[PDB]
Amino acid sequence: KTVLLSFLEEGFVKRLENAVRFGSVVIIQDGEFFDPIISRLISREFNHAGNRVTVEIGDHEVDVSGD
Amino acid sequence: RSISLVKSLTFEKERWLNTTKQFSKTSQELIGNCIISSIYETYFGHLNERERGDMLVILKRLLGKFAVKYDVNYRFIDYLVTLDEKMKWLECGLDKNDYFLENMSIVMNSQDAVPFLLDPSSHMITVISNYYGNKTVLLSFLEEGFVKRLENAVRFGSVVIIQDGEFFDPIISRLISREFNHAGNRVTVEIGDHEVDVSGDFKLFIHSCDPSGDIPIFLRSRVRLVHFVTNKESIETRIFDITLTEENAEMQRKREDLIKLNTEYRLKLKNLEKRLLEELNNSQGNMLENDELMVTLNNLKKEAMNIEKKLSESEEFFPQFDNLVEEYSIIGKH
Amino acid sequence: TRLVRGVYTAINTGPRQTLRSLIRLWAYEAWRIFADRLVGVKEKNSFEQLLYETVDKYLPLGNISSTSLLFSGLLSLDFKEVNKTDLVNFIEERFKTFCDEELEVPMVIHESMVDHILRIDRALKQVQGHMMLIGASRTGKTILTRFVAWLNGLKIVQPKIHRHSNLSDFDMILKKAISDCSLKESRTCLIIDESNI
Amino acid sequence: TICDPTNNKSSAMISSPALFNRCIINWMGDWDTKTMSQVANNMVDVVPMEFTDFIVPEVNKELVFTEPIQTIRDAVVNILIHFDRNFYQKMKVGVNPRSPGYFIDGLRALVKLVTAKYQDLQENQRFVNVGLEK
Amino acid sequence: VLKWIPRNLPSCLINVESSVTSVKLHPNLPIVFVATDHGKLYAFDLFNYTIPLASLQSHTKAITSMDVLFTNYTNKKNYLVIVTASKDLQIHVFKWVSEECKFQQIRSLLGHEHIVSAVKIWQKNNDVHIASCSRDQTVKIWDFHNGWSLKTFQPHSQWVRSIDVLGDYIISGSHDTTLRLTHWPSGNGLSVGTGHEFPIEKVKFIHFIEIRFRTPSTDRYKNWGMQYCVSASRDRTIKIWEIPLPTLAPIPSNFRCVLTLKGHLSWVRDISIRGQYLFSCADDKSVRCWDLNTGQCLHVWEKLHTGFVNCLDLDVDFDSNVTPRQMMVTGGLDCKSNVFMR
Amino acid sequence: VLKWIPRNLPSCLINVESSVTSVKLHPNLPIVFVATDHGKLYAFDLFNYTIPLASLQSHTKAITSMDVLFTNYTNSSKKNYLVIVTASKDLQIHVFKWVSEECKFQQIRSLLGHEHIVSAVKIWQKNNDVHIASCSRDQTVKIWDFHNGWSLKTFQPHSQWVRSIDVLGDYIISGSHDTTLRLTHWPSGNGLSVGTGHEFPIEKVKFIHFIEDEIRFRTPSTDRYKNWGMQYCVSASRDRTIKIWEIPLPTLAPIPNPTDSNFRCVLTLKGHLSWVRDISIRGQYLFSCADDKSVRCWDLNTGQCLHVWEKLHTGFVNCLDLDVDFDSNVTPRQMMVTGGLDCKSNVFMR
């Protein structure tokens, strides 16, 4: 359940969204090319929407599984 | 310990021996009793007492011709109806008449067919509502908003009674025939103009208070029509109850209390005997080896003695009520 | 003129014929044309006796009773006699599939249903074939019709006629069915029950 | 589909030449004795009925709608068919089509009831035996 | 395939509520049927064997024996018939419906006046028969389809403990030390024999197969169809007998012991022959295998049960409709059924 | 090797407890996997078949389809293993490992997400990626990731519910309860073309894979089709008919072609007496079976029957399996397995 992404490849956003939604352990390679599009994960600024916890990434809101 | 317990249980030994000796007759008469009961449920819903007697004579003649034994002392109520059902039904407001009790058991044991109840007095609406207590919906074929409320009742599983059944609307046909789509892990029914989930706890009753009405063929051939109408003995019982409550209320209260308490005592004693036999069955060893079982059976026998003593003592007063009842048979007859 | 056309169709889509099989086919079509309308048992017996007498008079064969002539196109490619056991087994399997896919009905299979299903199939393989089923309630009319229509790939249309409705709704339903039959090439079996009049 | 051919609307539907001269009239009628016999033989096939002694009853051929009676099931089927016929005859439903609804429902109810009561019989006998042995 | 001996340890252990009184192996599927001493019958799948596939309370007293036959109709679908005889003086006949994992009762056979001790079922053409014997000393034959008796006879003064069926003949082993061959469709006794010291627990035909005791030594026995049988009793001894040839009902003439097998410490409870080997068990908590050609014990399963072993099951090797699978089953007092696979 | 036709009789008869819903041959070992109507999966040895090698009650309703794949990870330092995928009427798909050293079904995981019975499931492997696709009575086609165990793609190709899917490269061709096939590009989920011409619901549809050899319908006709990777497909229906279709070529995600959006039926096969239940192509031969107790061997060059196994089963024939002759990782063995309604399967060998 370990996913290897990169800031230097295409399809990054969707695969990270799925990993967030299902709770996999993600490693993003080539960290020197950090993309601020995932800023809300680094700062962990989540919306505690009642019984759920969500994060705004890319252009929409994605459920955080918590694992 | 062992000798005392076996001496106490000798009564149950005798009863058990008699039961197993009667096993042969009991097995011989089973098929005939089942035939009689099934026919009685299927055909006798809309017949009067005389017609039921005639049909039972005919059926017994057929059983005789084709060499099928049956209980010559067969009674529908005694064969199918138990104490718990009787007590609960009477508590719900059912009349004490045998005819009403038979109709109640037939309509309550309609597991597959939608029951159609004919009650000119609408008594059975009250009885059913008391039986289910709550979550009971009263619709009508003669009012607006019927379809939506029935849809919701289906979806959530309430017990629905539709009044004025003579105005049956075929828009609910798929419920009467119970033609459901078993959609994988769900069961749905097409009603009105769309598909509605069946919760599975939903139950439907149709009621009419217009005798000699008009039930169309489609509904008539697919429902278990049961008549709930008064007879001689119901009228006489009600007349006597009015006479007694007007003349002498204390005997009324004593009579009702004695009857109720004796019936409860009988139920308790029956269940206690059942518990005794079950406990002796699952001993996991010899009775001497299991001291807890010995103590349990002794305690059960003590409870049985207490219950039977209470019933026997309470019964001693009833002939007074028998004479008091005989006092007013003139009013009954007239 | 119906009998003529029937015989034609049976010969045209059938296997190689023998005189015996040809005559048996003629008797089968005679049953379908003339005898299906008879009500009592005595009339059916008289018709069977009449078939025997006519054959002896003009066509001098085995048993040609109503249940001895089971011609079908369900079990094969041509239209020919079939074994009772094979047809019963095939109908049972297809009926289980029909229950699974369309509607669960725990109905028992017997010989009369097989005769009736065969004649309904015969009727629904005709050009402009229409039939009117008369018999007691809960004898399997509607469900058997639906099953046959499912076997032949027809869309089943049952008008939702109910209380507080009138000729406007019935006209709309008929118009929709007509439009679908014509413009969408939708093969349709339209079931009209007497309670809907 | 017509259920009551004697009703006014059904009589109009049948006698009207617009429908009469085009449709194939298929007289379903009602179930005969052979169909009832076959249906009953299917229904009671799974009921554990053969658990007692049975003596072949001496009856006339006109009273038997099945093969010659050998088993209890044959007698039960014949009894049920005879009772349905007598019910319709004595209730005097005229010449109406004999709906088989009652027969079917009675068959299902009999299957269920016999199953349940035979189970109760066997369990009670087993418990009595165990008690006496103990 | 036949030259196969089970390993020392069972592949599968099955626990039941109480003592196992009889076990039979489903003739075509990996299913084992277990009849216990409380009147119940279980069906277990050998690959899912913890919770039974089916659990039936059929009788009210202990089951004493059972037999299984898979029908071979020449026209009508085939199915498995299970016949269960108990101390209730009743023989219940069931159909196994693999599609619902249930025991569908077909009927019951009545008529014996005491505990039924053995049953046997066989088929001729499309006719199926059920034979049995009980403590009332009577041996009775029922027609499966009809549901009532066909024939009755009494072969012994003492009551018959076990029977076997081949062709149209039955050897019945008595509660006495004697055994008797009778002609099935007439009741005419044909041969008698003794040699045991105590009541006979088992007796069965030895069928000819393509071995010392499984081929006819003369054309007379080839025409008759059988020459040898085997029995065992409470004298701890297994005895293999030659069957005398009658006046070819046949008219009578004693059984001749041709080989005696010993080794058990207690009563012999089961006999089963697979190819070249005789498998048996005793009331000494052991199973054992003798060679049928030389009459020596080849292998011993000690302490297979903590109680006594009541029954064995091995496949028939003398029937074209039976696959001789390499699987053997044992069951005994201690509420255990041991299944040896491969 | 590819010229082999089975003998007129089975090499062995394998008995099971109830109706056989599907069969699959183990791609390397002489083992056959059989799934039945009660939710049970079985593994049998083909030389000692009298006792099952193993069995497992995984689902609770009938298994509707089974597919199997033997992995081939590219030097990923992982042990390769047979993955057995089954789908049932329980609205579930179960994914198992075959543990050959123990001869058992080891469950890997389960996939959820359908609202009705699953009518087909397929598994295929790319460079170092394994995918599981399914279609079900809810009218949707869903593709899950094998390793991750959750849905990758969803799309709805038909207005009626989908009965059979086959996958080739990045395309899915789906037959439905409707009479029309549809070809869709699965990565983007954009429908490309439809094939009309059947009268009754579709039972099977399969791509026709090119063979490096010449065969009438297993070779491209143009450079465009050769480069595309597909020229023809085959489908079978309940109208007693098997049709060989010529696939239209979209503009190369692929763009639907405004003027070539329809399939062209190039050949029709008739001769079965009932519903056609399975089809399989080996070499130049098309093997199929029907609900008429029979199997047929067709010559793909002329569209005729070459051989017929009549009364092979006492009931309907439900499933066929042959090996893959268009994959370098699969040996085209002289093996066939048929399984059917009569609680039997027949295995033809050598």
Ligand SMILES: Nc1ncnc2c1ncn2[C@@H]1O[C@H](COP(=O)(O)OP(=O)(O)O)[C@@H](O)[C@H]1O
């Ligand atoms: N052959 C049969 N076996 C068992 N039940 C039947 C049979 N035919 C009809 N029924 C009963 O009748 C009903 C189905 O017939 P249906 O088509 O509804 O008749 P109709 O709609 O013409 O009144 C069901 O309730 C079914 O139980």
